[PDB]
Structures are given as C-alpha cells and as structure tokens.
C-alpha cells in the first residue's frame, strides 16, 4: 500500500572527517639495536599482507591541497623530531670566543682551526682544545678590523642541542593506517590532475610505502608514476603557487666527498662528550654531485613537451633561483648523517621553444653535470621550532647513490607581451614532499545507520 | 567481501551484505592519542547501539517501524529505487530530513511501549 | 560459586553455571596501566557482545541456530560429548574450524532474516 | 522533566514516570579529568546494561521474574509499601539482601533458559 520506513544497520555511506592515524612498519625495522628515530618503540608493526579491494562503479572527488593527513604527518614528524633530541648532549659550554686561523700550511680555504678553551669533567680545571669548524658555522663578532675573533652561530639566537651519535637519518618506509570505523579511499586513475572526480576508487586500510625524505628544490627517492609526466597545481594562474612535476623515468644522481681524520672527542662535563671534526689527511677536494647529461636533457625535453599542453603558444625558460640566502636557493638534503646544500646553476640553464631535439649517440654518455658545493653542520630547518642541532661528522668518505622522482617549480611574474615565461625551482615549506607522496589517499568515515522504504509491518 | 563490498552495487543486492560492514566497527607521545581515538570509537559504537535500541530495534539488523512515510519527503517509486539506485545518492538526498524521521520513530516507539504496558496492566 | 566453578566438570553440569561466571566480565606510572586495562576489558566485552549480536542471539545465554552441523568438524557421538568431555579439550579440538562456523552462522542469520522480511512483507 | 522527576514521591506514583527519568544515561590538566569521566560513564552504562541483561529483562521496564519472594527480607504487606513509602528508605532497608536476590534471579533465568532449551529440543 503506502510507504513505511524501516531502519537499517550496516549501511555503506560515507562522510569526510579528520581523525588521528596510526603507524605501520616492516618486521626488519624492530631487530635493529640502533633504535632508529621513529619505528622501533613508538609505532606499531603491521601484517605482511596488505589487502586491497577495488570498488565497482563509484566516483569520488579528491582534493589533495585541502588534506588532513599532510598536516597530521607534518605535526607528527615535528613532534617526534623534537622528542628525539631531549636525552642528548647539549652544547651550551661552547660559546667561548674562538681564535681561528688557516688550516696549517696550505690552507683548505673552507675550514678554520678555531682553538678555544673548555671545561673538562672537573668543574675547576680547563683545557685548551682545537677542532676544524666549517666556514658557514663561524660568525665574525668584531668591533674593529679583527681577524682572529670568531664564535659559533647558534649561541646568538637559541640553543645548541646536539643530535645523539646513535640514531640515524635513514628514511625507512612507513605506512599510515586508518583507525576503527574509518577507511582510506585511493584513486587509481592515471590521468589524475590533482583535483576533481575519480572513477576507480579503491578502499584500503593501510597506505603504501612512504619515505619521509628531507629535501628541498628537488625530490629524492619516492614512488614513480605509471604512464607519463603529471603536472600538479591548484590554480595555475598566479606566480605564488608551487607547481609539482611528477616524472616517469629516473635519472641517476651521485654525491661524493674527500676524506677526514676521525671524530675528535671533546668532553664538556660529566658524560656529555661531543664529536668534532678532527684533522684532514691527504689532499683536499670539493664535495660534488654528478648527474647524467643526456638523461637530464631528454627528461627536461619530456617535461617541456608535456607542459606545452597547458601553454599552447608560449615558450618556457629556466634560470637560477630567485635570490635569497644559502638555505633556500640551494638543493638541500642529507646522506649518511651529513647534510648537503648544493647549487643548481648547471641543471636549470636552458629553454624549450616547442621543437623537439632527438639525442641518438651511444658514446655521448661519458659527459656529466657536476654540482660543486659546501657542507653545513648546524641545521635550522622546519622554518622555526627546529631545535637547532650540530650534526656530528663521519670519519671516512661517503657516497650518495640515489634516485630522483619529482621537481618543484614556481612561475615568475611576466611583463606586457611576454610570450616567453620562466620557471624557477624553489622549495619553501616542508609539506610539499609529503603532499606529493599522498595524492592518492583520502580518509573517510562510514555511517552504518540508514533508512529505506518498503512494506514491512511489525507484528504486535 | 570486506570493506564496502556493495558501496555502489544494486540496492536490492546491497541488502545481503550488511553483516560484514557491521562486524568490523571495533577491530608518552602516543599513549594518549590512540587511547582517545579508541575511546571515541567505543562511544561511537555505543551511541549507534543506543540509538538503535531507543526505537525498539536492538539486536536486529533490519528492523521495521509502524510510523508511515510522508509523500513530501521522497515522492519516488519503490521499484526503481530498490533496483536502480545506490546508497550514496540516497544519503545525499535524505540526510537533511533525518532528525524529524528519528523523532517520529521515537514517538512511535513511545506509543507502542505505552500500549504494551497498558495491555499488560489491564490483563 | 565463584570464578569458573565448573572449570573441569561434566559438559552437562557446565551448562547451569553460565550466569555466575559471565557476571565478572566488567567488575603516574601506576595510573596509565589501570586505565588501559579497564579500557581493554571494555573492548573485549563489547567485541563478545557484538559477535553475539550479529547472528540474532543477543541477550540470551543459550541460543539455537538453524545451520546444519557438518560431521567433518568433529565426527563424534553426542552422549559421551555431553556426559564425558570437559569444555577445554572440546574447544581445543574445534579451534581448527571456528571461522567456518562463525561464517555459517552469519550467513544463516542473514538468510533467515531475508526470509522473515519476505514473509512479513508478503502480508 | 529529566533527572529525578519523582525522587521523593509515592512508590506507586513513581511507576508512570520511569520513561522520562532514565533517558539521560549517555546524553594538559583539564583533559585527563574529561577522559576519566568519559571512561567512567562508559563503565557505568555498560555495567548497568549487562546487569539488566543477565536475567532476561533487556530493554524492558517493569520486568516480571518467576522467582518467589522470601518473607525474610521485608515481612510487611505490599499495600502500605506501594502507597505509603518512598524509594530512598526502602532502598536503605533492602540493601542488606541484594546479592542473594541477584543470585536468585540469575539462577531462575538460567533454569528458564534450560527449560526453553529442553522444550524446543523436545519437538
Ligand atoms: C635514496 O636511496 C639510496 C639507495 O636506496 C640510499 O642510499 C643508501 O644510503 C644508506 C644510508 O643513507 C647507505 O647505507 C650506508 O652504507 C655505507 C656503505 O655501505 C657499504 O659498506 C657496507 C659495509 O661497511 C656494506 O654492508 C654495504 O653493502 C656497502 O657495500 C655504510 O658504511 C653505512 O654504515 C653506517 O650506518 C650503520 C647503521 O646506521 C652504522 O652501524 C655504521 O657504523 C655506519 O655509520 C650505511 O650502512 C646505503 O649503502 C646506500 N645505498 C647504496 C646502494 O649505496 C639513499 O640514502 C636514499 N636517500 C637519499 C636522500 O638519497
Ligand atoms: C690548530 O691549532 C693547534 C694549536 O695551535 C694545532 O695543534 C698543534 O699541532 C702541532 C702539529 O703541527 C702539534 O705539534 C702541537 O702539539 C699541537 N698543539 C696542541 C694540540 O695544543 C693544530 O694542529 C691546528 N690545526 C690544524 C688543522 O693544523
Ligand atoms: C645575531 O642574530 C641576529 C638575527 O636574529 C643577526 O642579525 C642579522 O643576521 C643576519 C644573518 O647573518 C645578517 O645578514 C644581518 O646583517 C644581521 N642584521 C640585521 C640588522 O638584519 C645578528 O647579526 C647576530 N649577531 C651577530 C653578532 O652577528
Ligand atoms: C555499476 O552501475 C552500472 C549502471 O547500471 C552497472 O551497469 C554496473 O554493472 C555496476 N557495476 C557493478 C559492479 O555492479
Ligand atoms: C683559555 O684558557 C687558557 C687556560 O689555559 C688561557 O691561557 C687562555 O688565555 C684562554 N683564552 C683563549 C682565547 O685561549
Ligand atoms: C582500477 O585499478 C585497478 C588496480 O589494479 C586495475 O586493475 C583496474 O583495471 C582499474 N580500472 C580500470 C577501469 O582500468
Ligand atoms: C583561483 O581559482 C579561482 C577559481 O578556480 C579563480 O576564480 C581565481 O581567479 C584564481 N586565482 C587567481 C589569482 O587567478
Ligand atoms: C634568469 O634570471 C636572470 C636574473 O638576472 C635574468 O638576467 C635572465 O634573463 C633570466 N633568464 C635566463 C634564461 O637566464
Ligand atoms: C651558483 O652558481 C652560480 C654560477 O656558477 C653563481 O653565480 C652563484 O653565486 C652560485 N650560488 C648560488 C647560491 O646561486
Ligand atoms: C648556460 O648554457 C650556456 C650554453 O651552453 C653556457 O654558455 C652558459 O655558460 C651556461 N651557464 C649560464 C650561467 O648561463
Ligand atoms: C668512497 O667510499 C666508497 C664506499 O662508501 C668507496 O667505494 C670509494 O672508493 C670511496 N672513494 C674513494 C675515492 O676512495
Ligand atoms: C633509482 O634508479 C636505480 C637505477 O635506475 C634503481 O636501481 C633504484 O632502485 C632506484 N631507486 C628506487 C628507490 O627505486
């Protein structure tokens, strides 16, 4: 006859909500006695069988720019990073004035000797010690033309908390798992432009392998694409929104260094010892990064022919960074526990006008691109609340046989009748890397209650 | 089928799978956050169970209530609802009317229970 | 009695002691552990009660289902099971096949509810 | 009318107001106290629900149980009990004999369930 309402429990309907998430790590990350920095004592392990079920005919809108897991991941990384430097050595008795000269006979033109006095394990006795501090960690306090007085940089503003020499900065993968009563929708569309509907949504509980790499201006190890180069942006109208280029073919990049002596152990009290840079044996060279020439050339050509779809009659150009200090204009990362800040002058020096150039030469692979750069030791990252460190050095030489995944670009402001616009690389906020690694997923809440029309009559 | 096996399937065929989406509602730095989330999940399930039990539909998945359905709410034929539509569009176009439906179910349960105690007391 | 009074007695004599045993499922450094233990006790009880509530045996200590009993699970006679076997080795023997029984009760409950819905909507 | 509508009224007058008095059982430094009060509310509601659910009176006010009433608990007639005395002093004089009563209802409910088991298995 007429419609009578009936209640249903166990109904698959969805809403958008913001809740905290869990961890998930591999089984090999718990047998290590170095305790890592994230996945040994806090994060829970996962099962070795990630079940994924594809849904039939559902279309769901995705917005990777207005996301909750990016902000939660950033807050969790910041909090877990600040909690891992509390039981470590603090370099408060190192703000004494340093007397610094050239590095012996035949100076290296990059380090200063910087001999000082320090308090030993006895509170009365003091001893004269020496090191080799890097030049960007040395500030010339002066009142006249004095070339022998120097001090450390982090004693001026806030703290000198050294990292512990047991943990490591190795980026092992982690997975984010939704809590009970929540699911994660993942879009499998290959032509996903970042915002809009998706028609191959699959429901998963735990995310795939995410490596929280510390990098700016250029993306390190990460997940590749499937079909072609993908452009990620939210408006593509103004010049103040960072655009992400997601690649398809990796390009090999290595970074090397000359030798050092050892970790010179200097005591500043009971138990608190720090490892400074000792001597340098052998000849001194530069710390450089090598990138293949023809792979970078046809990769940038592929980026050009794919980016020409959004600009039909305009040529693209590249040049240097748009000014600033050391920390923002250089591609910065870390390897083996030592940080690198490297100039990108020889990578973004070119232009594309729409005419493709084919590179067919087998013997031309010998030519490479070299990036010469220096090393810092005190890191002021996260653009605030960073808990200013002092990275301990490594004894021998190191290698950085790495992989490249994406690029971060920013358009410059043009003038009238400017048909040739430029794209300069820039980093800035840390959220861009984890936003590039979390475009697929979206947290979702299920409501098991519902109503439906039928002809059910409850008996009395 | 596990999570959301019939989230876009046939309306008549989505009534055979409510058990698997209802079986799994409970299954220092991070000693408080997961605790708060777990207690929140427990109270979400308990609120759902109490809301089911407040109109006499506890322990039964598909329960029936004698309150009628007004023509100003859906005005659509039953056959193509149960054979063509899905749950998500139904939640899209019914969720603005849910509170008065819940109130009607509560009033109908109150009337049914008051007739039940009147019949028990008069006998 | 008390905590598991008929913990080793006859199978038949252990069916009249369900009430006095299931009643006790809810009754700084040393402040986190007590609260966590209380929350996980609530977790275990709510999981057990929900699992009883899926297959239509909510609020009943002893409930009967209409699923057939396959002989390949036990292959044993009823009389010596109910008069000679303690619950412990019985649960040890059936522990290799509990998920099949849970799925069969779930499917039988859903099928019985759909037949009841068809019979009730037929009128 | 929410909490304690007729807390000092007649025994028989409190029977018609039971449907409105028991409706609100669930409806840094100052975050831990909120968590503890939240968990304690969950404990109270779940304990009350299971204790009402052991002796077969789940989701039903004014439940009748076939256990006989012993004369050693009150030894006074029901007329002046139901039209003379309020709830509080009656609870004061009944509080010494609550565990024996709870055990008697538990045993009666379990025996009733076994009788229903034998009756349905007799067919
Ligand atoms: C992007 O991806 C690349 C490749 O996946 C990563 O490169 C790896 O980086 C890690 C560290 O960042 C390297 O691990 C280190 O290797 C050093 C040399 O390894 C050789 O020698 C050892 C024996 O000494 C052999 O077992 C090994 O197979 C190699 O032949 C080691 O000396 C290092 O040891 C240090 O760490 C351990 C544990 O923390 C300490 O106990 C030691 O005392 C010492 O301090 C370390 O194991 C790894 O070798 C690199 N891979 C390759 C192929 O070279 C990038 O790091 C990654 N990220 C970025 C940003 O580029
Ligand atoms: C930095 O200066 C110190 C002191 O001026 C140097 O330490 C001396 O090194 C010579 C070797 O040339 C030794 O003979 C002395 O005994 C050292 N004096 C000490 C330890 O008090 C140190 O070599 C200089 N650093 C560098 C890199 O040359
Ligand atoms: C102590 O820190 C302050 C910043 O809080 C320094 O002020 C500026 O520092 C930058 C970075 O080296 C310089 O480029 C500027 O020239 C500094 N001055 C101004 C007015 O911006 C300050 O110089 C530091 N103290 C010393 C002695 O160097
Ligand atoms: C999804 O809906 C379309 C619309 O009729 C239907 O043809 C298709 O079979 C559905 N998919 C599944 C898996 O049922
Ligand atoms: C440091 O302490 C020593 C004590 O031996 C003293 O001789 C010296 O003048 C002090 N200052 C410097 C700058 O070395
Ligand atoms: C959706 O993604 C899955 C992932 O394996 C794939 O198998 C399937 O073909 C995709 N759907 C379509 C229509 O391509
Ligand atoms: C950003 O996008 C909105 C709509 O997509 C548009 O109206 C607005 O003009 C854009 N911003 C700029 C600076 O053009
Ligand atoms: C890049 O920026 C510099 C800054 O002075 C400018 O001179 C140059 O024309 C720009 N373009 C190229 C292709 O170098
Ligand atoms: C990078 O290299 C260019 C040319 O080699 C040079 O002009 C510039 O000063 C270097 N440094 C930075 C931070 O751009
Ligand atoms: C860029 O490339 C041109 C062409 O090879 C070269 O002449 C120039 O030195 C390069 N570097 C800069 C900073 O322009
Ligand atoms: C640098 O270290 C690697 C091993 O980490 C070694 O194979 C290589 O020979 C070293 N470089 C030099 C110049 O010795
Ligand atoms: C990067 O590329 C090299 C060779 O192309 C490969 O061996 C390596 O596994 C790649 N990195 C990752 C993280 O897959």
DSSP A25: B
What region, left, alpha or beta, does residue B59 occupy, with left being phi > 0 and alpha being psi -120 to 50 degrees? left
Contact (CB, 8 A) for A400 and A335: yes
How many Cβ atoms sit within 10 Å of the Cβ of residue A163?
Answer: 20
- Whether the CA torsion D97, D98, D100, D104 is positive or negative: it is positive
Bridge pairing between strands A116-119 and A126-129: antiparallel
Give the separation between CA C31 and CA A32, rounded to whole angstroms: 31
Taking the CA of residue A159 and the nearest CA in chain B, the distance in Å comes to 23
Quick check: D62 contacting B, CB < 8 Å? yes
Between CA A120 and CA A97 the distance in angstroms is 17
- DSSP annotation string for B4-52: TTTSSS-TTTGGG-TTHHHH-S----SSSHHHHHHHHHHHHHHHHHHHH
Q: What are phi and psi of A171, to 5 degrees?
A: -85, 85
* Dihedral, A148, A151, A153, A156 alpha carbons, nearest 10: -130
- C/D Cβ contact: 3+ pairs below 8 Å: yes
What technique was this entry resolved by? cryo-EM
- CA–CA separation, D45 vs D51, rounded Å? 10
Phi/psi at A266 (nearest 5 deg)? Answer: -120, 125
Tokens of A149: 């007085």
Contacts of A44 (CB under 8 A, 6+ apart): A22, A23, A24, A25
- Residue for token pair 């591609």: A331
Q: Which residues of A302-327 are buried (b: 16+ CB within 10 A; e: fewer)?
A: bbbebbbeeeeeebbbbeebeeeeeb
Q: Classify residue B50 as exposed, middle or buried by CB count within 10 Å of its CB (0-12, 13-18, 19+).
A: middle
Q: Round to whole Å and give the CA distance between B4 and A13.
A: 9
- Which residue in A274, A277, A338 sits closest to A90, CA to CA? A274
Residue A358 makes CB contacts below 8 A (sequence gap 6+) with: none
Rounded Cα gap, residues B98 and A451, in angstroms: 9
Record: contact C120-A456, CB cut-off 8 A: yes
Which residue among C15, C45, C58 sits closest to D46, beta carbon to beta carbon? C45
Give Cβ neighbours of residue A138 (< 8 Å, ≥ 6 apart).
A98, A100, A112, A114, A150, A151, A152, A153
Q: Which residues contact A16 (CB under 8 A, 6 or more apart)?
A: A442, A443, A444, A445
CA B14 to CA B20: how far, in whole Å? 11
Minimum CA distance residue for ligand 12 atom 1: A403
How far is residue A228's CA from residue A308's CA, in Å, rounded to a whole number?
14
> Residue D81: helix, strand or coil by DSSP?
helix
User: Which two structure tokens, joined as six digits, stand for A153?
Assistant: 């940089």
Contact C54 B19 (CB under 8 A): yes
A221 CB near ligand 12 (under 6 Å): yes
Closest listed residue to residue A14, CA positions, set B27, B39, B90, B100? B90
Ligand in closest contact with the CA of A315: 8
Contact C16 D120 (CB under 8 A): no
Taking the CA atoms of residue C51, residue C54, residue C56 and residue C61 in that order, the dihedral angle to the nearest 10 degrees is 10
The rounded distance, in Å, linking the Cα atoms of A79 and D25 is 38
Beta strands A315-318 and A420-425 are: parallel
| C35 closest CA partner among D25, D32, A180, A179 | D32
In this complex, does chain A touch chain B, defined as having at least 3 beta-carbon pairs under 8 Å apart?
yes
C 26-45 → D contacts, CB under 8 A: 26-27, 35, 38-39, 42, 45
What span, in angstroms and rounded, lies between the C-alpha atoms of A112 and A151?
A: 11
Q: How far is the CA of A356 from the centre of ligand 4 (A)?
A: 44
Instruction: Specify the residue for token string 């031309």.
Output: A364
Can you tell me the distance from the alpha carbon of A70 to that of A21, in angstroms, rounded to the nearest whole number? 11
Closest listed residue to residue A116, CA positions, set A155, A157, A63: A155
State both tokens at A167: 């943990």
C43, C49, C52, C53: CA torsion to nearest 10: -110
Q: A422 CB less than 6 Å from ligand 8?
A: yes
Judge whether A258 and A282 are in contact, CB under 8 Å. yes
- Cβ distance A459 to C121 less than 8 Å, yes or no, reads no
Determine which helix (DSSP H) or strand (DSSP E) holds D20, and give its type and residue range. Answer: helix D18-21
Alpha-carbon distance of A456 to A299, in angstroms, equals 65
Whole-number Å distance between alpha carbons of B17 and B28: 40
Q: Compute and round to an integer the Cα radius of gyration of chain B.
A: 19
Distance A343 CA to ligand 9 centre (A): 6
Measured distance CA(A399)–CA(A253) in Å, rounded: 11
Residue from A339, A375, A331, A335 nearest A132 by CA: A375
d(CA A450, CA A296): 56
CA-CA distances (angstroms) from residue C47 to A89, A163, C121? Answer: 47, 45, 33
**Rounded distance from Cα A246 to ligand 12 centre (Å):** 16
Residues of C in contact with D118 (CB under 8 A): none
Of the ligands numbered here, which is closest to the C-alpha atom of A319?
A: 8
Answer whether A243's CB lies under 8 Å from A410's CB.
Answer: yes
Cα–Cα distances in angstroms (integers) from residue A342 to residues A14, A217, A287, B114, D56, in the given order:
47, 10, 9, 80, 75
* DSSP-assigned states of every residue in A410-444: EEPP--TT--EEEEEE---STHHHHHHT-SSEEEE
Question: For residue A91, what are the contacts with CB-CB under 8 A and spacing of at least 6?
Answer: A152, A160, A161, A162, A268, A274, A390
The β-bridge partners of A456 are none
Give, rounded to a whole angstrom, the gap between the first and last alpha carbons of chain D. 50
Contact (CB<8Å) B50/D19: no
The span from the CA of B28 to the CA of D113, in Å, is 48
Q: At A134, which helix (H) or strand (E)?
A: strand A133-134
Distance CA A41, CA A33 (A): 11
Check pocket membership of A153 for ligand 3, CB cut-off 6 A.
no
Beta carbons within 10 angstroms of residue D46's beta carbon: 19
Any D CB within 8 A of C1 CB: no
CB contact, 8 Å: A92 with chain C? no
Q: Which residues of A fall within a CB distance of 8 Å from C117? A: 454, 456
Q: How many pairs of residues across A and C have Cβ atoms under 8 Å apart?
A: 10
The ligand minimizing its distance to the Cα of A100 is: 2
Atom of ligand 7 nearest to the CA of A238: 13
How far apart CA A155 and CA A170 sit, in angstroms, is: 28
Mapped onto helix, strand or coil, the DSSP state of residue D96 is: helix
Strands A4-15, A315-318: pairing is unpaired
For A317, how many CA atoms within 13 A lie in the half-sphere containing its CB?
11
Residue pair A205/A59 in contact (Cβ under 8 Å)? The answer is no
Strand A315-318 to strand A287-292: parallel, antiparallel, or no bridges (unpaired)?
unpaired
* Under 8 Å between Cβ of B93 and B76: no
| Positive or negative torsion for Cα D36, D38, D39, D45 | positive
Q: How far is the CA of A375 from the centre of ligand 3 (A)?
A: 21
Using alpha carbons only, give the angle A347, A351, A355 rounded to the nearest 5 degrees.
Answer: 130
Measure the N-to-C terminal CA separation of chain C; round to a whole number of Å.
Answer: 50
User: Angle, nearest 10°, between helix axes B33-53 and D32-54?
Assistant: 40
- Asked whether A259 lines ligand 11 (CB < 6 A), one says no
Is the CB of residue A2 less than 8 Å from the CB of residue B68? Answer: yes
Asked whether the beta carbons of B65 and A5 are under 8 A apart, the reply is yes
Domain ranges of chain B: 4-120
Q: Which two tokens stand for residue B16?
A: 């055979």
d(CA A387, CA C58): 56
Handedness of CA D34, D35, D40, D46 (dihedral sign): positive
DSSP A84-126: TSTTS-B--TT-SPBB---SSSS--SSEE--BEEEE-SSSS-E
Q: How many CB atoms lie within 10 A of CB C58?
A: 17
Enumerate the β-bridge partners of residue A444: A183
Give yes or no for a contact between B2 and A53, defined as CB atoms under 8 angstroms apart. yes
Mutate to test the interface with D, among B50, B58, B60, B63 (most CBs of D within 10 A): B50
C-beta neighbour count of D31 within 10 angstroms: 10
Give the length of chain C: 123
At C31, phi and psi to the nearest 5? -115, -30
List, as one string, the DSSP characters of D36-80: HHHHHHHHHHHHHHHHHHHTT-TT-SS--------TTS--S-HHH
Angle at Cα A447 formed by Cα A441 and Cα A450, nearest 5°? 140
Residue whose structure tokens are 């861009």: A432
CB atoms near residue A366 (< 10 Å): 7
Residues paired with residue A204 on neighbouring β-strands, in sequence order? A52, A184
Interface of B with A in 41-70 (CB under 8 A): 41, 44-45, 48, 51-52, 55, 57, 61-69
Number of residues that this document lists for chain B: 123
A54, containing H or E segment? strand A52-54
Q: Say if residues A211 and A334 touch (Cβ distance below 8 Å).
A: no
B88 contacts A444 by C-beta, under 8 angstroms: no
CB atoms within 10 A of CB A383: 11
Q: How many CA atoms lie within 13 A of A350 on its CB side?
A: 16
Is residue A156 in contact with ligand 3, taking CB distance under 6 Å?
A: yes
Query: Ligand 12 centre and the CA of A373: distance in Å?
Result: 24
DSSP state of A136: G
- Do A218 and A408 form a contact (C-beta atoms < 8 A)? yes
Residues of B in contact with C39 (CB under 8 A): 35, 38-39, 42
Nearest CA to C15 out of D113, D67, D108 is that of D113
How many angstroms separate the CA of residue D111 from the nearest CA in chain B? 23
Residue linked to tokens 């009943």: C60
What length is written for chain A? 460
Contact B34 A20 (CB under 8 A): yes
- The residues facing A318 across adjacent strands are A350
Contact residues, chain C, for D46 at CB < 8 Å: 26, 42, 45-46
Report how far residue A251's alpha carbon sits from residue A248's, in angstroms, rounded to the nearest whole number: 10
In a 10 Å sphere around its CB, with 0-12 CB exposed, 13-18 middle and 19+ buried, how is residue A421 labelled?
middle
Q: Which residues pair with A266 in a beta bridge?
A: A274
Q: How far apart are CA A378 and CA A151, in angstroms?
A: 13
Q: Specify the resolution in Å.
A: 3.8
Pairing label, strands A182-187, A441-454: antiparallel
């Amino acid at each position: 006859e007429n419609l009578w309402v009936t209640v249903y429990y166990g109904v698959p309907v969805w809403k958008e909500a913001k809740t905290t998430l869990f961890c998930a790590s591999d089984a090999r990350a718990y047998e290590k006695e170095v305790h890592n920095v994230w996945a040994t004592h806090a994060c829970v392990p996962t099962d070795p069988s990630p079940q994924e079920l594809v849904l039939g005919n559902v279309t769901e809108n995705f917005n990777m720019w207005k996301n909750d897991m990016v902000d939660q991941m950033h807050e969790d990384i910041i909090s877990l990073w600040d909690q891992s430097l509390k039981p470590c050595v603090k370099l408060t008795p190192l703000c004494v004035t340093l007397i610094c000269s050239d590095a012996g006979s035949g100076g290296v033109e990059e380090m200063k000797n910087c001999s000082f006095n320090t308090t030993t394990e006895i509170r009365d006795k003091e001893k004269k010690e020496y090191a080799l501090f890097y030049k960007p960690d040395i500030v010339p306090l002066s009142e006249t033309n004095n070339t022998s007085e120097y001090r450390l940089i982090n004693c001026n503003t806030s703290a000198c908390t050294q990292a512990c020499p047991k943990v490591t900065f190795e980026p092992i993968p982690i997975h984010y798992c939704a809590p009970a009563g929540y699911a994660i929708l993942k879009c499998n569309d290959e032509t996903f432009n970042g915002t809009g509907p998706c028609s191959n949504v699959s429901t998963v509980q735990c995310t795939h392998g995410i490596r929280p790499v510390v990098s700016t201006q250029l993306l390190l190890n990460g997940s590749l694409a499937e079909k072609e180069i993908v452009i990620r942006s939210e408006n593509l109208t103004n010049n103040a929104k960072i655009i992400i280029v997601h690649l398809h073919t990796p390009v090999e990049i290595v970074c090397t260094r000359p030798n050092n002596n050892t970790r010179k152990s200097v005591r500043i009290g009971p138990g608190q010892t720090f490892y400074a840079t000792g001597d340098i044996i052998g000849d001194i060279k530069q710390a450089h990064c090598n990138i293949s020439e023809e792979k970078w050339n046809d990769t940038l050509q592929k980026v050009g022919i794919e980016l020409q779809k959004h600009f039909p009659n305009k040529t693209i150009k590249y040049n240097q960074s748009a000014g600033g200090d050391m920390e923002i204009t250089t591609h910065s990362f870390n390897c083996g526990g030592e940080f690198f800040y490297c100039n990108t002058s020889n990578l973004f020096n070119g232009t594309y006008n729409g005419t493709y150039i084919s590179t067919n030469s087998s013997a031309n692979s010998t030519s490479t691109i070299t990036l010469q750069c220096r090393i810092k030791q005190i890191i002021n990252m996260w653009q605030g609340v960073g808990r200013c460190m002092y990275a301990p050095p490594i004894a021998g030489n190191i290698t950085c046989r790495s992989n490249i995944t994406g690029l971060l670009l920013t358009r410059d402001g043009g003038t009238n009748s400017n048909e040739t616009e430029t794209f300069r690389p820039a980093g800035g906020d840390m959220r861009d890397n984890w936003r590039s690694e979390l475009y697929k997923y979206k947290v979702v809440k299920i409501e098991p209650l519902g109503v439906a029309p039928t002809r059910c009559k409850r008996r009395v | 089928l596990g999570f959301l096996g019939a989230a876009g399937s046939t309306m008549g065929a989505a009534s055979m799978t409510l058990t698997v989406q209802a079986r799994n509602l409970l299954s220092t730095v991070w000693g408080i956050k997961q605790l708060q989330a777990r207690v929140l999940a427990v109270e979400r399930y308990l609120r759902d169970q109490q809301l089911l039990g407040i109109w006499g539909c506890s322990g039964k998945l598909i329960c029936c209530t004698n309150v009628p359905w007004n023509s100003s709410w859906s005005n659509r034929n039953l056959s193509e609802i149960w054979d063509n539509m899905t749950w998500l569009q139904w939640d899209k176009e019914i969720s603005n009317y849910t509170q008065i439906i819940y109130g009607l179910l509560e009033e109908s349960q109150n009337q049914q229970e008051k007739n039940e105690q009147d019949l028990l007391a008069l006998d």
